[PDB]
Structure formats: structure tokens, C-alpha cells
């Protein structure tokens, strides 16, 4: 079973070493394609880095809008979870109520 199988495997492995350098080429083309897919991801990466790493203005607002896209997606989310209480600062009558978001005075944030 494995004797003729291995001999034919050696011959087809000559053929497939030729076709495996050919795979170098073809999967190189699919490599550029997948590079380019994850590099549209990466151009999102660049764009957002240059835009919002100097100072996260919309990365602040995207902590926000993407915690809310996460929690516009928490519908699927059976997930038990825990945010923090001083996050939603449901501390309405508190000293640290607007320690949470008088951090709007930049420096606390």
C-alpha cells in the first residue's frame, strides 16, 4: 500500500517541488492579496495612528462610540459583564460624581 504510494509520491514530489516553487509564486500573489486585505486593515491602522495618536480626540470619542458600538452589539452579547460604576457615574449625588466627568477639564482626562 505504502510502497507504490511512496514511489509515486517521490515522482509527484519532483512535480510538486516544481509546482511548490510555483506555489511560492502563486501564494506570493495571494500573499500580496492578503497583505493588501490586512493592509486595508493596516491603512485604517496608519490613518487612525496619525490622526489620533498625537492626542486621542476621536480615539477618546471612539472609546466612547465603540464602547457604544460594542453596546450597540451587546444585544448578541448574552455576556454577563461588568463595567465600572464610576464609569456610568451613577453617583448622581456624590463628590466623585463629577470627578468622573468634570475630567472634561483636560488633565483629569
Amino acid at each position: 500500500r505504502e510502497y507504490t504510494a511512496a514511489v509515486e509520491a517521490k515522482q509527484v514530489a519532483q512535480q510538486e517541488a516544481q509546482r511548490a516553487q510555483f506555489l511560492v509564486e502563486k501564494a506570493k500573489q495571494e500573499q500580496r492579496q492578503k497583505i493588501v486585505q490586512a493592509e486595508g486593515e493596516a491603512e485604517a491602522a496608519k490613518m487612525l495612528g496619525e490622526a489620533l495618536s498625537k492626542n486621542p480626540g476621536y480615539i477618546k470619542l471612539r472609546k466612547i462610540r465603540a464602547a457604544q458600538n460594542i453596546s450597540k452589539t451587546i444585544a448578541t452579547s448574552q455576556n454577563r459583564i461588568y463595567l465600572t460604576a464610576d464609569n456610568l457615574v451613577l453617583n448622581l449625588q456624590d463628590e466623585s460624581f463629577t470627578r468622573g466627568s468634570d475630567s472634561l477639564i483636560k488633565g483629569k482626562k
Partner: protein
Amino acid sequence: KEFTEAVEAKQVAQQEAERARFVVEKAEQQKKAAIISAEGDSKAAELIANSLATAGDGLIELRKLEAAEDIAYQLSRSRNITYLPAGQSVLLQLPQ
């Protein structure tokens, strides 16, 4: 079975290698498209960034408050969502 399959794979792979040179071209074009769409999102975002940087954290927090209504709107289409204060020593113990 691997001989004919290997020959057809080599032929299809040459066709796909030329088609995939042109698909790397297509991928540059489709990335112009995807960059510019994800940047519909993200250029809306950068102009928001400029608004909040020049003006301050106004709607940083106020879409952290208006969209914080989204928390109470949308948390418990499931049944186990909650939170836990910080600056403290919480004994976190998730529900069952």
C-alpha cells in the same frame, strides 16, 4: 489522484497567478475603496477628533452620555450585564 490534480493545480495556479497580479492591482483599487469607506467612518472620526480637540472634550463625554443612553437601551437584550465601582476594592463575582 494527485498527478492530474497536481497538473490542474499548476495550470489553475498559473491562471490565478496572472489573474492575481491583476488581483493585486484590483486590491490596490479595492483598498482605495475600503480605505475611503472605513474612512467615511474614520474621517467623520477625524473631524470629530478636531472638533473635540479644538473645542475640548464636550461630546467626548456627551456622546459618552448620549450614547451612554445606549448602555441602558441595549445592555440587557441579554440578562446578565452590570458594572462595579472603581477607586475601590470590589469583590467582583460575575452572575450565574
